[PDB]
Tab-separated table of all heavy atoms in Angstrom:
chain	number	residue	atom	x	y	z
A	27	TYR	N	130.411	20.630	189.665
A	27	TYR	CA	131.488	21.250	190.418
A	27	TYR	C	130.903	21.489	191.925
A	27	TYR	O	129.742	22.004	192.056
A	27	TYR	CB	131.758	22.583	189.897
A	27	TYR	CG	132.776	22.474	188.656
A	27	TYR	CD1	132.374	22.982	187.435
A	27	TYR	CD2	133.977	21.947	188.815
A	27	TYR	CE1	133.315	22.975	186.388
A	27	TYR	CE2	134.884	21.925	187.711
A	27	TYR	CZ	134.505	22.408	186.537
A	27	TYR	OH	135.364	22.482	185.389
A	28	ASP	N	131.672	21.141	192.958
A	28	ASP	CA	131.341	21.418	194.239
A	28	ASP	C	131.936	22.741	194.632
A	28	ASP	O	133.011	23.124	194.075
A	28	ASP	CB	131.907	20.349	195.187
A	28	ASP	CG	131.228	19.062	195.010
A	28	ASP	OD1	129.993	18.963	195.203
A	28	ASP	OD2	131.921	18.114	194.802
A	29	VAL	N	131.351	23.591	195.475
A	29	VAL	CA	131.948	24.796	195.939
A	29	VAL	C	132.556	24.785	197.244
A	29	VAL	O	131.743	24.479	198.213
A	29	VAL	CB	130.941	25.970	195.796
A	29	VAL	CG1	131.673	27.267	196.063
A	29	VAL	CG2	130.219	26.006	194.484
A	30	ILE	N	133.829	25.027	197.350
A	30	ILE	CA	134.606	25.000	198.485
A	30	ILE	C	135.114	26.382	198.617
A	30	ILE	O	135.688	26.823	197.699
A	30	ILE	CB	135.580	23.916	198.590
A	30	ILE	CG1	134.912	22.484	198.545
A	30	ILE	CG2	136.600	24.029	199.770
A	30	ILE	CD1	135.868	21.253	198.325
A	31	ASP	N	134.938	26.933	199.870
A	31	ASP	CA	135.505	28.289	199.987
A	31	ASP	C	134.663	29.064	198.936
A	31	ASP	O	133.443	29.038	199.048
A	31	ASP	CB	136.828	28.476	199.673
A	31	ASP	CG	137.509	29.614	200.420
A	31	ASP	OD1	137.573	29.650	201.514
A	31	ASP	OD2	138.004	30.522	199.635
A	32	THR	N	135.224	29.799	198.094
A	32	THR	CA	134.598	30.543	197.139
A	32	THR	C	134.831	29.999	195.678
A	32	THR	O	134.235	30.391	194.763
A	32	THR	CB	134.860	32.009	197.200
A	32	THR	OG1	134.332	32.802	196.086
A	32	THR	CG2	136.409	32.242	197.325
A	33	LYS	N	135.844	29.045	195.612
A	33	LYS	CA	136.237	28.471	194.425
A	33	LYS	C	135.502	27.080	194.203
A	33	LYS	O	134.977	26.530	195.202
A	33	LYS	CB	137.777	28.239	194.525
A	33	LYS	CG	138.602	29.508	194.549
A	33	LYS	CD	139.861	29.293	195.363
A	33	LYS	CE	139.546	29.140	196.788
A	33	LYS	NZ	138.940	30.441	197.374
A	34	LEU	N	135.591	26.522	192.986
A	34	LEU	CA	134.952	25.338	192.710
A	34	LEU	C	135.910	24.242	192.220
A	34	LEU	O	136.912	24.377	191.606
A	34	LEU	CB	133.850	25.514	191.622
A	34	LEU	CG	133.994	26.585	190.516
A	34	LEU	CD1	135.336	26.624	189.922
A	34	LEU	CD2	132.866	26.401	189.519
A	35	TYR	N	135.529	22.974	192.831
A	35	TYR	CA	136.381	21.873	192.490
A	35	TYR	C	135.420	20.666	192.021
A	35	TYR	O	134.384	20.502	192.505
A	35	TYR	CB	137.057	21.393	193.840
A	35	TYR	CG	138.018	22.610	194.284
A	35	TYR	CD1	137.606	23.357	195.391
A	35	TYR	CD2	139.134	22.932	193.487
A	35	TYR	CE1	138.408	24.393	195.755
A	35	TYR	CE2	139.857	23.984	193.915
A	35	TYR	CZ	139.504	24.785	194.979
A	35	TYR	OH	140.225	25.806	195.246
A	36	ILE	N	136.065	19.878	191.077
A	36	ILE	CA	135.266	18.848	190.448
A	36	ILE	C	134.346	17.963	191.343
A	36	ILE	O	134.859	17.492	192.356
A	36	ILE	CB	136.104	18.042	189.488
A	36	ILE	CG1	136.415	18.767	188.167
A	36	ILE	CG2	135.476	16.713	189.092
A	36	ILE	CD1	137.433	18.080	187.313
A	37	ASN	N	133.210	17.675	190.867
A	37	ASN	CA	132.296	16.844	191.574
A	37	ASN	C	132.403	15.541	190.742
A	37	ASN	O	131.759	15.506	189.682
A	37	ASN	CB	130.867	17.254	191.695
A	37	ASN	CG	129.961	16.284	192.304
A	37	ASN	OD1	129.923	15.107	191.942
A	37	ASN	ND2	129.165	16.773	193.321
A	38	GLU	N	133.130	14.528	191.254
A	38	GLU	CA	133.328	13.319	190.409
A	38	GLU	C	132.053	12.811	189.745
A	38	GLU	O	132.032	12.417	188.599
A	38	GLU	CB	133.882	12.213	191.253
A	38	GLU	CG	135.396	12.275	191.513
A	38	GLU	CD	136.149	12.763	190.171
A	38	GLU	OE1	135.567	12.606	189.220
A	38	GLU	OE2	137.173	13.247	190.335
A	39	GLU	N	130.968	12.754	190.544
A	39	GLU	CA	129.593	12.298	190.082
A	39	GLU	C	129.063	12.951	188.917
A	39	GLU	O	128.832	12.370	187.922
A	39	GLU	CB	128.728	12.278	191.274
A	39	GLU	CG	128.769	10.863	191.953
A	39	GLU	CD	128.695	9.874	190.893
A	39	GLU	OE1	127.942	9.877	189.962
A	39	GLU	OE2	129.629	8.928	190.999
A	40	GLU	N	128.778	14.380	189.276
A	40	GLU	CA	128.169	15.129	188.120
A	40	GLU	C	129.107	15.278	187.042
A	40	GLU	O	128.684	15.474	185.955
A	40	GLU	CB	127.783	16.488	188.788
A	40	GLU	CG	127.273	16.336	190.188
A	40	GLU	CD	126.657	17.635	190.710
A	40	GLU	OE1	127.139	18.803	190.337
A	40	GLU	OE2	125.710	17.536	191.606
A	41	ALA	N	130.386	15.337	187.308
A	41	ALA	CA	131.286	15.435	186.214
A	41	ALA	C	131.186	14.360	185.176
A	41	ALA	O	131.229	14.576	183.938
A	41	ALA	CB	132.718	15.417	186.718
A	42	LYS	N	130.931	13.160	185.643
A	42	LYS	CA	130.608	11.999	184.710
A	42	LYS	C	129.503	12.271	183.876
A	42	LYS	O	129.533	12.097	182.588
A	42	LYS	CB	130.531	10.821	185.567
A	42	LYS	CG	130.638	9.511	184.954
A	42	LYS	CD	130.908	8.511	186.102
A	42	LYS	CE	130.726	7.018	185.562
A	42	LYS	NZ	130.529	6.185	186.731
A	43	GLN	N	128.416	12.694	184.502
A	43	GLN	CA	127.167	12.980	183.677
A	43	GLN	C	127.361	13.901	182.632
A	43	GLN	O	126.926	13.918	181.508
A	43	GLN	CB	126.081	13.448	184.671
A	43	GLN	CG	125.494	12.284	185.500
A	43	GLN	CD	124.232	12.592	186.203
A	43	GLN	OE1	123.285	13.083	185.710
A	43	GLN	NE2	124.284	12.594	187.670
A	44	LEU	N	128.296	14.912	182.900
A	44	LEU	CA	128.542	15.887	181.763
A	44	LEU	C	129.244	15.304	180.695
A	44	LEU	O	128.984	15.739	179.606
A	44	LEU	CB	129.306	17.046	182.323
A	44	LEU	CG	128.573	18.339	182.755
A	44	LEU	CD1	128.071	18.171	184.103
A	44	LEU	CD2	129.355	19.593	182.592
A	45	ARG	N	130.042	14.429	180.951
A	45	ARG	CA	131.004	13.838	179.893
A	45	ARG	C	129.974	12.993	179.049
A	45	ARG	O	129.981	13.106	177.777
A	45	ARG	CB	131.998	12.925	180.359
A	45	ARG	CG	133.015	13.770	181.256
A	45	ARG	CD	134.363	13.136	181.319
A	45	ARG	NE	135.353	13.731	182.227
A	45	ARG	CZ	135.436	13.545	183.431
A	45	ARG	NH1	134.635	12.668	184.090
A	45	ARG	NH2	136.251	14.158	184.293
A	46	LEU	N	129.049	12.367	179.759
A	46	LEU	CA	128.128	11.504	178.980
A	46	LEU	C	127.177	12.386	178.215
A	46	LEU	O	127.002	12.136	177.012
A	46	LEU	CB	127.202	10.703	180.039
A	46	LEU	CG	126.212	9.821	179.354
A	46	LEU	CD1	126.835	9.141	178.253
A	46	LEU	CD2	125.667	8.885	180.437
A	47	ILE	N	126.672	13.468	178.804
A	47	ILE	CA	125.812	14.385	178.097
A	47	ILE	C	126.552	15.021	176.899
A	47	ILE	O	125.969	14.920	175.827
A	47	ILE	CB	125.425	15.532	178.901
A	47	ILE	CG1	124.319	15.088	179.854
A	47	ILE	CG2	125.199	16.812	178.165
A	47	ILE	CD1	124.106	16.010	181.171
A	48	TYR	N	127.695	15.581	177.095
A	48	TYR	CA	128.463	16.170	176.034
A	48	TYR	C	128.754	15.133	174.916
A	48	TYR	O	128.889	15.465	173.727
A	48	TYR	CB	129.771	16.614	176.584
A	48	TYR	CG	129.945	18.115	176.814
A	48	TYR	CD1	129.380	18.677	177.953
A	48	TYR	CD2	130.548	18.961	175.835
A	48	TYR	CE1	129.443	20.139	178.162
A	48	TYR	CE2	130.514	20.222	175.986
A	48	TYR	CZ	129.935	20.843	177.239
A	48	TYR	OH	129.980	22.196	177.350
Side-chain angles (χ1 to χ4, degrees):
Chain A
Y27 285 122
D28 287 306
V29 186
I30 293 170
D31 201 65
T32 169
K33 294 148 290 296
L34 30 49
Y35 301 107
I36 287 174
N37 176 309
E38 283 320 339
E39 266 320 310
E40 323 189 323
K42 199 160 165 198
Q43 289 187 60
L44 262 83
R45 300 208 187 83
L46 181 45
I47 281 164
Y48 258 82

